[PDB]
């Protein structure tokens, strides 16, 4: 849970797993820990980065060339551009369960980074690139130099997520309608479960031996309506589900 993989210390893509889509997590302390780690490590000025040491859309790396040479000493340090998608995930995550002040704070933060286009409608840029000239200053003063938009910005994913979050926050829709399967109650503890065990005798001698010591069981016979076989037969039977010629 704490680490996305064995090579990346932390990834902002873990938010989606531990937010609105596909709630699959337990031990909410882990949720709080990973949220705090992401906030402390990846937060920036106009967004957050996917992971440390990524060179996408950089004034270096010779973009017309792939298969990064093993020369990542400092050429991709503290210059990860930005990604407001993790910002637009936070408002939905807060507004889902019980948070309100975080929702207002994140909405206020996000409204400042917006760009107004044709017909005056919200538009979400993909990323903000560092200027090619002011690179040395960022190495000594990280998260201080202003950035400019770069790349495509008809981002349907982020725009759709922001629209859905705004519509949900407006109160027109309830959280119980988006998920009819009730997947928002995965943090409720389960007390315990009682286990039932049945004991059988292989033949009459075994039954006699167990009844000698005071253990009462029934043999394989006498339960004719019920049959017992090993599990490999069950696996072979299950090997026929969903077959088409």
């Amino acid at each position: 849970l704490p680490r996305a993989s064995t090579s990346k210390e932390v990834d902002a893509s873990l938010l989606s797993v531990v937010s609105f889509p596909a709630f699959a997590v337990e031990d909410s302390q882990l949720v709080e820990l990973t949220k705090q780690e992401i906030i402390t490590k990846l937060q920036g000025r106009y967004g957050c980065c996917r992971f440390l040491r990524d060179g996408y859309k950089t004034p270096k790396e010779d973009p017309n060339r792939l298969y990064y040479e093993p020369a990542e000493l400092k050429l991709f340090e503290n210059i990860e551009c930005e990604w407001p998608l993790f910002w637009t995930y936070f408002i939905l995550d807060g507004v889902f369960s019980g948070n309100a002040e975080q929702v207002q704070e994140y909405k206020e933060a996000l409204e400042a980074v917006l760009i107004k286009g044709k017909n005056g409608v919200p538009l979400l840029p993909e990323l903000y690139s560092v200027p090619p000239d002011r690179v040395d200053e960022e190495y000594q003063n990280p998260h201080t130099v202003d950035r400019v938009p770069m790349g495509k910005l008809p981002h349907m994913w982020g725009q759709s997520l922001y629209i859905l979050g705004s519509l949900m926050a407006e109160g027109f829709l309830a959280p119980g309608e988006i998920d009819p399967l009730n997947r928002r109650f995965s943090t409720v503890p389960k007390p315990d479960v009682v286990v039932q065990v049945s004991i059988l005798a292989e033949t009459e001698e075994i039954k006699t031996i167990l009844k000698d010591k005071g253990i009462y069981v029934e043999t394989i016979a006498e339960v004719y309506p019920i049959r017992v076989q090993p599990a490999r037969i069950l696996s072979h039977i299950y090997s026929s589900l969903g077959c088409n010629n």
């Binding site: 309830a174 119980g176 309608e177 009730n182």
Partner: protein, 78 residues
């Protein structure tokens, strides 16, 4: 007036299954009353749902409908 062959899907007079047929299937909705009773029933395999888990839907007694019907048909001039 309806002929014998036509009386198959008429409202308030005959059923869809036909005049000489009665095989209606009736739906029932099962709802619990308390969480403790719900979990006690679930322990034995009986599935029931608490009234707090049907938030979009509402369950009201029979007096509210009577009051609402009483509200209808009031005229002040006469």
């Amino acid at each position: 007036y309806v002929p014998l062959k036509d009386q198959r899907n008429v409202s308030m007079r005959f059923s869809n299954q036909g005049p000489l047929e009665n095989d209606l299937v009736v739906h029932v909705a099962l709802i619990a009353e308390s969480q403790r009773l719900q979990v006690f029933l679930n322990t034995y395999g009986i599935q029931t749902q608490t009234p707090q888990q049907v938030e979009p839907i509402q369950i009201w007694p029979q007096q509210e409908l009577v009051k609402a019907y009483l509200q209808l048909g009031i005229n002040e001039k006469l």
